[PDB]
PDB file of all heavy atoms in Angstrom:
ATOM      1  N   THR A   1      62.568 112.602  81.751  1.00  0.00           N
ATOM      2  CA  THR A   1      62.708 112.046  83.088  1.00  0.00           C
ATOM      3  C   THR A   1      64.074 112.422  83.655  1.00  0.00           C
ATOM      4  O   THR A   1      65.092 112.256  82.978  1.00  0.00           O
ATOM      5  CB  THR A   1      62.538 110.529  83.077  1.00  0.00           C
ATOM      6  OG1 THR A   1      61.302 110.180  82.458  1.00  0.00           O
ATOM      7  CG2 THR A   1      62.578 109.977  84.492  1.00  0.00           C
ATOM      8  N   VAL A   2      64.083 112.915  84.889  1.00  0.00           N
ATOM      9  CA  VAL A   2      65.311 113.360  85.543  1.00  0.00           C
ATOM     10  C   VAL A   2      65.862 112.189  86.336  1.00  0.00           C
ATOM     11  O   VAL A   2      65.178 111.614  87.191  1.00  0.00           O
ATOM     12  CB  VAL A   2      65.031 114.559  86.457  1.00  0.00           C
ATOM     13  CG1 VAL A   2      66.335 115.031  87.097  1.00  0.00           C
ATOM     14  CG2 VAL A   2      64.378 115.686  85.680  1.00  0.00           C
ATOM     15  N   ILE A   3      67.114 111.845  86.059  1.00  0.00           N
ATOM     16  CA  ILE A   3      67.819 110.762  86.750  1.00  0.00           C
ATOM     17  C   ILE A   3      69.018 111.371  87.453  1.00  0.00           C
ATOM     18  O   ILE A   3      69.860 112.017  86.821  1.00  0.00           O
ATOM     19  CB  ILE A   3      68.253 109.652  85.790  1.00  0.00           C
ATOM     20  CG1 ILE A   3      67.048 109.130  85.012  1.00  0.00           C
ATOM     21  CG2 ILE A   3      68.923 108.522  86.556  1.00  0.00           C
ATOM     22  CD1 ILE A   3      67.417 108.260  83.825  1.00  0.00           C
ATOM     23  N   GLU A   4      69.100 111.160  88.768  1.00  0.00           N
ATOM     24  CA  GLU A   4      70.217 111.676  89.566  1.00  0.00           C
ATOM     25  C   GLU A   4      71.317 110.618  89.560  1.00  0.00           C
ATOM     26  O   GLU A   4      71.222 109.599  90.245  1.00  0.00           O
ATOM     27  CB  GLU A   4      69.760 111.995  90.979  1.00  0.00           C
ATOM     28  CG  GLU A   4      70.835 112.601  91.856  1.00  0.00           C
ATOM     29  CD  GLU A   4      70.336 112.962  93.238  1.00  0.00           C
ATOM     30  OE1 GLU A   4      69.152 112.707  93.525  1.00  0.00           O
ATOM     31  OE2 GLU A   4      71.136 113.495  94.041  1.00  0.00           O
ATOM     32  N   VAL A   5      72.364 110.858  88.771  1.00  0.00           N
ATOM     33  CA  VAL A   5      73.480 109.942  88.687  1.00  0.00           C
ATOM     34  C   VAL A   5      74.700 110.570  89.336  1.00  0.00           C
ATOM     35  O   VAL A   5      75.467 111.288  88.689  1.00  0.00           O
ATOM     36  CB  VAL A   5      73.787 109.547  87.226  1.00  0.00           C
ATOM     37  CG1 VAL A   5      74.790 108.407  87.176  1.00  0.00           C
ATOM     38  CG2 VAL A   5      72.506 109.167  86.507  1.00  0.00           C
ATOM     39  N   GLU A   6      74.887 110.323  90.631  1.00  0.00           N
ATOM     40  CA  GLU A   6      76.071 110.792  91.323  1.00  0.00           C
ATOM     41  C   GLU A   6      77.247 109.853  91.023  1.00  0.00           C
ATOM     42  O   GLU A   6      77.105 108.864  90.311  1.00  0.00           O
ATOM     43  CB  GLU A   6      75.806 110.903  92.828  1.00  0.00           C
ATOM     44  CG  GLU A   6      75.612 109.587  93.549  1.00  0.00           C
ATOM     45  CD  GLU A   6      74.180 109.087  93.472  1.00  0.00           C
ATOM     46  OE1 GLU A   6      73.419 109.581  92.615  1.00  0.00           O
ATOM     47  OE2 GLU A   6      73.825 108.185  94.259  1.00  0.00           O
ATOM     48  N   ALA A   7      78.404 110.180  91.570  1.00  0.00           N
ATOM     49  CA  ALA A   7      79.601 109.412  91.291  1.00  0.00           C
ATOM     50  C   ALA A   7      79.391 107.943  91.673  1.00  0.00           C
ATOM     51  O   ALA A   7      78.931 107.649  92.782  1.00  0.00           O
ATOM     52  CB  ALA A   7      80.798 109.977  92.051  1.00  0.00           C
ATOM     53  N   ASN A   8      79.737 107.045  90.766  1.00  0.00           N
ATOM     54  CA  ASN A   8      79.668 105.610  91.004  1.00  0.00           C
ATOM     55  C   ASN A   8      81.062 105.099  91.282  1.00  0.00           C
ATOM     56  O   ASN A   8      81.970 105.305  90.477  1.00  0.00           O
ATOM     57  CB  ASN A   8      79.069 104.881  89.800  1.00  0.00           C
ATOM     58  CG  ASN A   8      77.544 104.977  89.733  1.00  0.00           C
ATOM     59  OD1 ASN A   8      76.932 104.343  88.883  1.00  0.00           O
ATOM     60  ND2 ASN A   8      76.936 105.778  90.613  1.00  0.00           N
ATOM     61  N   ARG A   9      81.234 104.437  92.416  1.00  0.00           N
ATOM     62  CA  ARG A   9      82.545 103.990  92.874  1.00  0.00           C
ATOM     63  C   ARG A   9      82.688 102.493  92.616  1.00  0.00           C
ATOM     64  O   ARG A   9      81.802 101.710  92.970  1.00  0.00           O
ATOM     65  CB  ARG A   9      82.737 104.299  94.352  1.00  0.00           C
ATOM     66  CG  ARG A   9      82.551 105.764  94.690  1.00  0.00           C
ATOM     67  CD  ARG A   9      82.363 106.000  96.175  1.00  0.00           C
ATOM     68  NE  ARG A   9      81.116 105.393  96.673  1.00  0.00           N
ATOM     69  CZ  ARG A   9      80.106 106.061  97.183  1.00  0.00           C
ATOM     70  NH1 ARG A   9      80.122 107.381  97.312  1.00  0.00           N
ATOM     71  NH2 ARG A   9      79.034 105.395  97.599  1.00  0.00           N
ATOM     72  N   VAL A  10      83.804 102.110  91.990  1.00  0.00           N
ATOM     73  CA  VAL A  10      84.057 100.709  91.696  1.00  0.00           C
ATOM     74  C   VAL A  10      84.580 100.023  92.949  1.00  0.00           C
ATOM     75  O   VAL A  10      85.558 100.469  93.553  1.00  0.00           O
ATOM     76  CB  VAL A  10      85.058 100.574  90.545  1.00  0.00           C
ATOM     77  CG1 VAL A  10      85.234  99.120  90.145  1.00  0.00           C
ATOM     78  CG2 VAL A  10      84.611 101.399  89.349  1.00  0.00           C
ATOM     79  N   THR A  11      83.913  98.940  93.345  1.00  0.00           N
ATOM     80  CA  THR A  11      84.291  98.193  94.536  1.00  0.00           C
ATOM     81  C   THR A  11      85.017  96.887  94.236  1.00  0.00           C
ATOM     82  O   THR A  11      85.773  96.416  95.091  1.00  0.00           O
ATOM     83  CB  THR A  11      83.051  97.874  95.381  1.00  0.00           C
ATOM     84  OG1 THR A  11      82.202  96.968  94.677  1.00  0.00           O
ATOM     85  CG2 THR A  11      82.284  99.143  95.701  1.00  0.00           C
ATOM     86  N   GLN A  12      84.804  96.292  93.067  1.00  0.00           N
ATOM     87  CA  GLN A  12      85.429  95.028  92.734  1.00  0.00           C
ATOM     88  C   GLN A  12      85.519  94.908  91.218  1.00  0.00           C
ATOM     89  O   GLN A  12      84.576  95.276  90.500  1.00  0.00           O
ATOM     90  CB  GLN A  12      84.637  93.849  93.318  1.00  0.00           C
ATOM     91  CG  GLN A  12      85.289  92.510  93.064  1.00  0.00           C
ATOM     92  CD  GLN A  12      84.537  91.372  93.743  1.00  0.00           C
ATOM     93  OE1 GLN A  12      83.530  91.597  94.416  1.00  0.00           O
ATOM     94  NE2 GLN A  12      85.021  90.150  93.561  1.00  0.00           N
ATOM     95  N   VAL A  13      86.639  94.394  90.744  1.00  0.00           N
ATOM     96  CA  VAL A  13      86.883  94.157  89.326  1.00  0.00           C
ATOM     97  C   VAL A  13      87.055  92.662  89.129  1.00  0.00           C
ATOM     98  O   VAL A  13      87.897  92.036  89.805  1.00  0.00           O
ATOM     99  CB  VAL A  13      88.094  94.926  88.807  1.00  0.00           C
ATOM    100  CG1 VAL A  13      88.320  94.634  87.333  1.00  0.00           C
ATOM    101  CG2 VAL A  13      87.919  96.419  89.027  1.00  0.00           C
ATOM    102  N   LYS A  14      86.277  92.080  88.230  1.00  0.00           N
ATOM    103  CA  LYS A  14      86.304  90.650  87.969  1.00  0.00           C
ATOM    104  C   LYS A  14      87.087  90.369  86.684  1.00  0.00           C
ATOM    105  O   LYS A  14      87.054  91.161  85.748  1.00  0.00           O
ATOM    106  CB  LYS A  14      84.889  90.100  87.862  1.00  0.00           C
ATOM    107  CG  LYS A  14      84.003  90.474  89.027  1.00  0.00           C
ATOM    108  CD  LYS A  14      82.815  89.557  89.168  1.00  0.00           C
ATOM    109  CE  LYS A  14      82.291  89.550  90.596  1.00  0.00           C
ATOM    110  NZ  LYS A  14      81.122  88.647  90.763  1.00  0.00           N
ATOM    111  N   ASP A  15      87.797  89.243  86.677  1.00  0.00           N
ATOM    112  CA  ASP A  15      88.618  88.850  85.537  1.00  0.00           C
ATOM    113  C   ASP A  15      88.366  87.394  85.187  1.00  0.00           C
ATOM    114  O   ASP A  15      87.874  86.612  86.009  1.00  0.00           O
ATOM    115  CB  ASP A  15      90.105  89.107  85.836  1.00  0.00           C
ATOM    116  CG  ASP A  15      90.737  88.075  86.783  1.00  0.00           C
ATOM    117  OD1 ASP A  15      90.174  86.983  86.985  1.00  0.00           O
ATOM    118  OD2 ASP A  15      91.815  88.371  87.320  1.00  0.00           O
ATOM    119  N   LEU A  16      88.691  87.043  83.941  1.00  0.00           N
ATOM    120  CA  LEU A  16      88.459  85.681  83.479  1.00  0.00           C
ATOM    121  C   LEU A  16      89.281  84.678  84.275  1.00  0.00           C
ATOM    122  O   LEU A  16      88.866  83.524  84.437  1.00  0.00           O
ATOM    123  CB  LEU A  16      88.791  85.574  81.996  1.00  0.00           C
ATOM    124  CG  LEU A  16      87.749  86.141  81.033  1.00  0.00           C
ATOM    125  CD1 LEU A  16      87.760  87.654  81.056  1.00  0.00           C
ATOM    126  CD2 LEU A  16      88.001  85.620  79.620  1.00  0.00           C
ATOM    127  N   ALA A  17      90.441  85.096  84.775  1.00  0.00           N
ATOM    128  CA  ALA A  17      91.315  84.151  85.485  1.00  0.00           C
ATOM    129  C   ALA A  17      90.634  83.610  86.736  1.00  0.00           C
ATOM    130  O   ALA A  17      90.730  82.409  87.032  1.00  0.00           O
ATOM    131  CB  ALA A  17      92.637  84.841  85.854  1.00  0.00           C
ATOM    132  N   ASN A  18      89.958  84.461  87.484  1.00  0.00           N
ATOM    133  CA  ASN A  18      89.335  84.068  88.743  1.00  0.00           C
ATOM    134  C   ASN A  18      87.844  83.771  88.590  1.00  0.00           C
ATOM    135  O   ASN A  18      87.379  82.686  88.942  1.00  0.00           O
ATOM    136  CB  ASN A  18      89.546  85.163  89.797  1.00  0.00           C
ATOM    137  CG  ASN A  18      89.730  84.622  91.196  1.00  0.00           C
ATOM    138  OD1 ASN A  18      90.251  83.508  91.375  1.00  0.00           O
ATOM    139  ND2 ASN A  18      89.300  85.371  92.202  1.00  0.00           N
ATOM    140  N   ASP A  19      87.085  84.746  88.068  1.00  0.00           N
ATOM    141  CA  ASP A  19      85.632  84.610  87.988  1.00  0.00           C
ATOM    142  C   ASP A  19      85.138  83.991  86.687  1.00  0.00           C
ATOM    143  O   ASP A  19      83.954  83.689  86.585  1.00  0.00           O
ATOM    144  CB  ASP A  19      84.989  85.988  88.153  1.00  0.00           C
ATOM    145  CG  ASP A  19      85.143  86.534  89.554  1.00  0.00           C
ATOM    146  OD1 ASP A  19      85.220  85.732  90.500  1.00  0.00           O
ATOM    147  OD2 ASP A  19      85.183  87.773  89.721  1.00  0.00           O
ATOM    148  N   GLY A  20      86.021  83.786  85.714  1.00  0.00           N
ATOM    149  CA  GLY A  20      85.600  83.258  84.429  1.00  0.00           C
ATOM    150  C   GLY A  20      84.955  84.275  83.513  1.00  0.00           C
ATOM    151  O   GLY A  20      84.578  83.910  82.393  1.00  0.00           O
ATOM    152  N   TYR A  21      84.798  85.516  83.955  1.00  0.00           N
ATOM    153  CA  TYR A  21      84.233  86.583  83.146  1.00  0.00           C
ATOM    154  C   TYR A  21      84.694  87.906  83.728  1.00  0.00           C
ATOM    155  O   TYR A  21      85.086  87.979  84.901  1.00  0.00           O
ATOM    156  CB  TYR A  21      82.709  86.506  83.107  1.00  0.00           C
ATOM    157  CG  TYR A  21      82.052  86.978  84.370  1.00  0.00           C
ATOM    158  CD1 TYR A  21      81.341  88.165  84.410  1.00  0.00           C
ATOM    159  CD2 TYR A  21      82.139  86.223  85.541  1.00  0.00           C
ATOM    160  CE1 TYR A  21      80.740  88.596  85.571  1.00  0.00           C
ATOM    161  CE2 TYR A  21      81.544  86.649  86.705  1.00  0.00           C
ATOM    162  CZ  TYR A  21      80.847  87.838  86.710  1.00  0.00           C
ATOM    163  OH  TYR A  21      80.250  88.255  87.880  1.00  0.00           O
ATOM    164  N   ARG A  22      84.636  88.947  82.916  1.00  0.00           N
ATOM    165  CA  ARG A  22      85.125  90.270  83.308  1.00  0.00           C
ATOM    166  C   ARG A  22      83.942  91.199  83.553  1.00  0.00           C
ATOM    167  O   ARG A  22      83.092  91.366  82.672  1.00  0.00           O
ATOM    168  CB  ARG A  22      86.068  90.833  82.241  1.00  0.00           C
ATOM    169  CG  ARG A  22      85.511  90.834  80.835  1.00  0.00           C
ATOM    170  CD  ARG A  22      86.591  91.191  79.840  1.00  0.00           C
ATOM    171  NE  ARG A  22      87.027  92.575  79.983  1.00  0.00           N
ATOM    172  CZ  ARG A  22      88.156  93.082  79.478  1.00  0.00           C
ATOM    173  NH1 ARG A  22      89.000  92.315  78.800  1.00  0.00           N
ATOM    174  NH2 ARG A  22      88.443  94.346  79.662  1.00  0.00           N
ATOM    175  N   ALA A  23      83.930  91.797  84.741  1.00  0.00           N
ATOM    176  CA  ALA A  23      82.860  92.709  85.138  1.00  0.00           C
ATOM    177  C   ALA A  23      83.413  93.643  86.198  1.00  0.00           C
ATOM    178  O   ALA A  23      84.431  93.358  86.832  1.00  0.00           O
ATOM    179  CB  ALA A  23      81.638  91.942  85.664  1.00  0.00           C
ATOM    180  N   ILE A  24      82.717  94.775  86.383  1.00  0.00           N
ATOM    181  CA  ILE A  24      83.050  95.707  87.451  1.00  0.00           C
ATOM    182  C   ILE A  24      81.816  95.867  88.323  1.00  0.00           C
ATOM    183  O   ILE A  24      80.701  96.000  87.811  1.00  0.00           O
ATOM    184  CB  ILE A  24      83.523  97.070  86.916  1.00  0.00           C
ATOM    185  CG1 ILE A  24      82.399  97.834  86.211  1.00  0.00           C
ATOM    186  CG2 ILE A  24      84.728  96.869  85.994  1.00  0.00           C
ATOM    187  CD1 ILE A  24      82.725  99.271  85.890  1.00  0.00           C
ATOM    188  N   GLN A  25      82.017  95.832  89.632  1.00  0.00           N
ATOM    189  CA  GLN A  25      80.944  96.013  90.601  1.00  0.00           C
ATOM    190  C   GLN A  25      81.056  97.402  91.201  1.00  0.00           C
ATOM    191  O   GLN A  25      82.114  97.786  91.675  1.00  0.00           O
ATOM    192  CB  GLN A  25      81.012  94.951  91.691  1.00  0.00           C
ATOM    193  CG  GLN A  25      80.027  95.114  92.810  1.00  0.00           C
ATOM    194  CD  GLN A  25      79.934  93.886  93.680  1.00  0.00           C
ATOM    195  OE1 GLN A  25      79.276  92.903  93.320  1.00  0.00           O
ATOM    196  NE2 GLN A  25      80.599  93.911  94.824  1.00  0.00           N
ATOM    197  N   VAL A  26      79.951  98.151  91.175  1.00  0.00           N
ATOM    198  CA  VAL A  26      79.966  99.551  91.566  1.00  0.00           C
ATOM    199  C   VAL A  26      78.943  99.772  92.677  1.00  0.00           C
ATOM    200  O   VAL A  26      78.016  98.985  92.869  1.00  0.00           O
ATOM    201  CB  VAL A  26      79.667 100.496  90.384  1.00  0.00           C
ATOM    202  CG1 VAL A  26      80.697 100.316  89.273  1.00  0.00           C
ATOM    203  CG2 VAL A  26      78.259 100.253  89.841  1.00  0.00           C
ATOM    204  N   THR A  27      79.135 100.866  93.421  1.00  0.00           N
ATOM    205  CA  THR A  27      78.238 101.262  94.482  1.00  0.00           C
ATOM    206  C   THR A  27      77.978 102.758  94.357  1.00  0.00           C
ATOM    207  O   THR A  27      78.762 103.504  93.766  1.00  0.00           O
ATOM    208  CB  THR A  27      78.814 100.926  95.862  1.00  0.00           C
ATOM    209  OG1 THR A  27      77.763 100.978  96.840  1.00  0.00           O
ATOM    210  CG2 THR A  27      79.909 101.912  96.242  1.00  0.00           C
ATOM    211  N   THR A  28      76.857 103.189  94.933  1.00  0.00           N
ATOM    212  CA  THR A  28      76.474 104.584  94.871  1.00  0.00           C
ATOM    213  C   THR A  28      75.709 104.962  96.134  1.00  0.00           C
ATOM    214  O   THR A  28      75.180 104.100  96.839  1.00  0.00           O
ATOM    215  CB  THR A  28      75.627 104.881  93.625  1.00  0.00           C
ATOM    216  OG1 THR A  28      75.383 106.293  93.537  1.00  0.00           O
ATOM    217  CG2 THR A  28      74.294 104.140  93.698  1.00  0.00           C
ATOM    218  N   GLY A  29      75.640 106.262  96.389  1.00  0.00           N
ATOM    219  CA  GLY A  29      74.922 106.757  97.543  1.00  0.00           C
ATOM    220  C   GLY A  29      75.733 106.597  98.829  1.00  0.00           C
ATOM    221  O   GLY A  29      76.963 106.513  98.829  1.00  0.00           O
ATOM    222  N   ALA A  30      75.007 106.565  99.933  1.00  0.00           N
ATOM    223  CA  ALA A  30      75.599 106.413 101.247  1.00  0.00           C
ATOM    224  C   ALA A  30      74.679 105.585 102.136  1.00  0.00           C
ATOM    225  O   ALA A  30      73.495 105.459 101.866  1.00  0.00           O
ATOM    226  CB  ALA A  30      75.876 107.776 101.920  1.00  0.00           C
ATOM    227  N   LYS A  31      75.258 105.016 103.177  1.00  0.00           N
ATOM    228  CA  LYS A  31      74.523 104.189 104.130  1.00  0.00           C
ATOM    229  C   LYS A  31      74.895 104.591 105.546  1.00  0.00           C
ATOM    230  O   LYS A  31      75.996 105.089 105.801  1.00  0.00           O
ATOM    231  CB  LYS A  31      74.807 102.697 103.933  1.00  0.00           C
ATOM    232  CG  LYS A  31      73.977 102.056 102.818  1.00  0.00           C
ATOM    233  CD  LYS A  31      72.562 101.763 103.288  1.00  0.00           C
ATOM    234  CE  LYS A  31      72.500 100.503 104.147  1.00  0.00           C
ATOM    235  NZ  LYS A  31      72.943  99.295 103.426  1.00  0.00           N
ATOM    236  N   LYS A  32      73.963 104.374 106.476  1.00  0.00           N
ATOM    237  CA  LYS A  32      74.251 104.625 107.873  1.00  0.00           C
ATOM    238  C   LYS A  32      75.353 103.700 108.365  1.00  0.00           C
ATOM    239  O   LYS A  32      75.384 102.507 108.043  1.00  0.00           O
ATOM    240  CB  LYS A  32      72.993 104.436 108.714  1.00  0.00           C
ATOM    241  CG  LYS A  32      71.924 105.489 108.490  1.00  0.00           C
ATOM    242  CD  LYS A  32      70.613 105.110 109.175  1.00  0.00           C
ATOM    243  CE  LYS A  32      69.690 106.300 109.284  1.00  0.00           C
ATOM    244  NZ  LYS A  32      69.225 106.768 107.949  1.00  0.00           N
ATOM    245  N   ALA A  33      76.264 104.252 109.166  1.00  0.00           N
ATOM    246  CA  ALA A  33      77.379 103.452 109.656  1.00  0.00           C
ATOM    247  C   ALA A  33      76.892 102.282 110.493  1.00  0.00           C
ATOM    248  O   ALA A  33      77.417 101.167 110.388  1.00  0.00           O
ATOM    249  CB  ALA A  33      78.333 104.333 110.489  1.00  0.00           C
ATOM    250  N   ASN A  34      75.868 102.505 111.325  1.00  0.00           N
ATOM    251  CA  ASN A  34      75.339 101.447 112.180  1.00  0.00           C
ATOM    252  C   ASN A  34      74.401 100.502 111.459  1.00  0.00           C
ATOM    253  O   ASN A  34      73.958  99.504 112.064  1.00  0.00           O
ATOM    254  CB  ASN A  34      74.653 102.092 113.397  1.00  0.00           C
ATOM    255  CG  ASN A  34      73.213 102.518 113.117  1.00  0.00           C
ATOM    256  OD1 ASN A  34      72.685 102.357 112.017  1.00  0.00           O
ATOM    257  ND2 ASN A  34      72.556 103.051 114.149  1.00  0.00           N
ATOM    258  N   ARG A  35      74.066 100.770 110.202  1.00  0.00           N
ATOM    259  CA  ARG A  35      73.143  99.933 109.449  1.00  0.00           C
ATOM    260  C   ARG A  35      73.853  98.949 108.530  1.00  0.00           C
ATOM    261  O   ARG A  35      73.297  97.882 108.238  1.00  0.00           O
ATOM    262  CB  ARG A  35      72.192 100.795 108.625  1.00  0.00           C
ATOM    263  CG  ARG A  35      71.237 100.038 107.715  1.00  0.00           C
ATOM    264  CD  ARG A  35      70.176  99.302 108.518  1.00  0.00           C
ATOM    265  NE  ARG A  35      69.306 100.213 109.248  1.00  0.00           N
ATOM    266  CZ  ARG A  35      68.264  99.839 109.986  1.00  0.00           C
ATOM    267  NH1 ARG A  35      67.946  98.554 110.133  1.00  0.00           N
ATOM    268  NH2 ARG A  35      67.543 100.747 110.610  1.00  0.00           N
ATOM    269  N   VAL A  36      75.075  99.261 108.081  1.00  0.00           N
ATOM    270  CA  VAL A  36      75.807  98.354 107.218  1.00  0.00           C
ATOM    271  C   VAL A  36      76.375  97.223 108.079  1.00  0.00           C
ATOM    272  O   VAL A  36      76.999  97.448 109.115  1.00  0.00           O
ATOM    273  CB  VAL A  36      76.922  99.098 106.483  1.00  0.00           C
ATOM    274  CG1 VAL A  36      77.921  99.730 107.446  1.00  0.00           C
ATOM    275  CG2 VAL A  36      77.643  98.157 105.523  1.00  0.00           C
ATOM    276  N   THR A  37      76.145  95.988 107.625  1.00  0.00           N
ATOM    277  CA  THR A  37      76.613  94.827 108.378  1.00  0.00           C
ATOM    278  C   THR A  37      78.126  94.681 108.249  1.00  0.00           C
ATOM    279  O   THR A  37      78.764  95.266 107.375  1.00  0.00           O
ATOM    280  CB  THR A  37      75.919  93.552 107.885  1.00  0.00           C
ATOM    281  OG1 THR A  37      76.322  93.282 106.542  1.00  0.00           O
ATOM    282  CG2 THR A  37      74.413  93.710 107.946  1.00  0.00           C
ATOM    283  N   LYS A  38      78.685  93.879 109.147  1.00  0.00           N
ATOM    284  CA  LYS A  38      80.142  93.648 109.131  1.00  0.00           C
ATOM    285  C   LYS A  38      80.612  93.014 107.840  1.00  0.00           C
ATOM    286  O   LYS A  38      81.632  93.481 107.287  1.00  0.00           O
ATOM    287  CB  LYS A  38      80.544  92.812 110.348  1.00  0.00           C
ATOM    288  CG  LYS A  38      80.869  93.646 111.571  1.00  0.00           C
ATOM    289  CD  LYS A  38      81.410  92.794 112.711  1.00  0.00           C
ATOM    290  CE  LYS A  38      82.915  92.917 112.815  1.00  0.00           C
ATOM    291  NZ  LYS A  38      83.421  92.341 114.106  1.00  0.00           N
ATOM    292  N   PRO A  39      79.968  91.974 107.315  1.00  0.00           N
ATOM    293  CA  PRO A  39      80.438  91.422 106.026  1.00  0.00           C
ATOM    294  C   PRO A  39      80.468  92.444 104.915  1.00  0.00           C
ATOM    295  O   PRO A  39      81.389  92.431 104.096  1.00  0.00           O
ATOM    296  CB  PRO A  39      79.425  90.296 105.749  1.00  0.00           C
ATOM    297  CG  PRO A  39      78.869  89.929 107.074  1.00  0.00           C
ATOM    298  CD  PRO A  39      78.856  91.196 107.877  1.00  0.00           C
TER     299      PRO A  39
END
């Protein structure tokens, strides 16, 4: 099975001090400028 794995960009890093656990949040691909909401 062919999986297209382009560059994954880290958007947020979580730590035990704030979130109580350590994790990284990543994003991939692209979105239309007028389609992504303000938040």
Side-chain angles (χ1 to χ4, degrees):
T1 305
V2 182
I3 305 167
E4 183 178 1
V5 190
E6 69 275 16
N8 280 186
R9 304 164 295 243
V10 185
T11 66
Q12 183 176 359
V13 179
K14 309 201 156 180
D15 76 17
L16 283 73
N18 215 31
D19 291 331
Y21 75 109
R22 52 189 293 163
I24 68 169
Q25 175 167 281
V26 300
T27 196
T28 186
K31 278 282 282 299
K32 290 171 165 66
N34 83 359
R35 176 70 65 178
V36 61
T37 66
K38 271 186 103 167

